[PDB]
Amino acid sequence: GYSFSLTTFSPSGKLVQIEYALAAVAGGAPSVGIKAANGVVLATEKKQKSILYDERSVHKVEPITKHIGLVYSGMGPDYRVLVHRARKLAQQYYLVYQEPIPTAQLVQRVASVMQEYTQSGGVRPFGVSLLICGWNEGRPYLFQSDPSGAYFAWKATAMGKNYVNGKTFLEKRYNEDLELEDAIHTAILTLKESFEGQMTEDNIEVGICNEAGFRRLTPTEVKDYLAAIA
């Protein structure tokens, strides 16, 4: 192999170290995100290695502004860097324009941050992909960045381990028009496809977007939502 480095090409194809960085994304915790007709639902998987770990200490669904949330699938230590980057970057729009930043504008800029660590030549890229949600100007949005620097606009997707089983699930599942309450029902039902044995109120962690702003769900509702609703 040529690869060994980031500042040169292969004689045939593309940059190989960015492809190896995507392998760490696929070996992460699974996640799912569904864009409904009135909101976007984020849901992820969160299991401790033991019964000793306090579950209410470190969170996965993480708000950026009062209408923008964000999840990941990769390495949590690299995740905390670009979250703190995206917080301070979102305030710089608000100091200039005095207006809450639209969701298509962070993804212009957050991907340009993940761009810059793919430069020369002694730094490493991230090993984290993202999912960014928000309800700006009526219509809600659901995007996805990558360590290479590109981005998307999804109807529904799933990252992490066993994403091909969740994708063929959602290809057979996701329709165009449902409410947010039906969207969470098919967002846990796709998390049950690749989860482990027990699924309690602490194994999952779910956040939503209304038009009334971003909100993450406390385990009182999530216990009552997973209570026999499939």
Binding site: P77, V123, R124
Partner: protein, 239 residues
């Protein structure tokens, strides 16, 4: 197999990197084990000492380190990397009081520590400090807490805690220990903190071979136990 990324900090094919996870086995050259236990409104650190010389002193050996007046810690791993980690912990604890005007939470401090350990993984050209840190502290409206920072930049707060050489044997004891709903009335905490380390190491130690740091919600100051009252808790469990 790899082989590939085993000199510097770049990726492997599928999918990890090895220089950070070689620091996880860089703790084990200390030859030491530390245990932290949170059961109820108090919090207990316990760690043995190993003095191999009579010319060697006693006061300059202790791994219990007072960060602020209400926050104490213990250090494992190799010795020289541990103390430079403490110097950053003492420094940024005072910047919080200067910038923000109040006492720093124990939760907020491990964010500031693991982010410094994060840059050394992301950006290269500095050895990533092969030591581990365990914190305790009292929080208002939250009770006592126990946190652990990792050399990779990971942190998680959790109730019963082991480190050093014998994590997988001590945590296996504490999973079976913290499953019954017994209360933890400040001597149920200490006696389990002794007998877990006492059976995993298989030492059942003589009184002058350990250290015990404590904090409690009746006196939130960090407190290192006197050698006399260490004997008092040792004669308490073996009645």
């Amino acid at each position: 197999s790899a082989g590939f990324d085993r000199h510097i900090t770049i990726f492997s094919p599928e999918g990890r990197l090895y220089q950070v996870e070689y620091a996880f086995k860089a703790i084990n050259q200390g030859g030491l084990t530390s245990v932290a236990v949170r059961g109820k409104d108090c919090a207990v650190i316990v760690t043995q000492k190993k003095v191999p010389d009579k010319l060697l002193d006693s006061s300059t050996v202790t791994h219990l380190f007072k960060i602020t007046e209400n926050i104490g810690c213990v250090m494992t791993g190799m010795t020289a990397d541990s103390r430079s980690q403490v110097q950053r912990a003492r420094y940024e604890a005072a910047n919080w009081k200067y910038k923000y005007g109040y006492e720093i939470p124990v939760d907020m401090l491990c964010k500031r520590i693991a982010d410094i350990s994060q840059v050394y993984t992301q950006n290269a050209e500095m050895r990533p400090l092969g030591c581990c840190m365990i914190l305790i502290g009292i929080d208002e409206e939250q009770g006592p807490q126990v946190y652990k920072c990792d050399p990779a930049g990971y942190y998680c707060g959790f109730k019963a805690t082991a480190a050093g050489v014998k994590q997988t044997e001590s945590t296996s004891f504490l999973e079976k220990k913290v499953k019954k709903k017994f209360d933890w009335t400040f001597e149920q905490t200490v006696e389990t903190a002794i007998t877990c380390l006492s059976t995993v190491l298989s030492i059942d130690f003589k009184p002058s071979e350990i250290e015990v740091g404590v904090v409690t919600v009746e006196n939130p100051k960090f407190r290192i136990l006197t050698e006399a009252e260490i004997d008092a808790h040792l004669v308490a469990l073996a009645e």
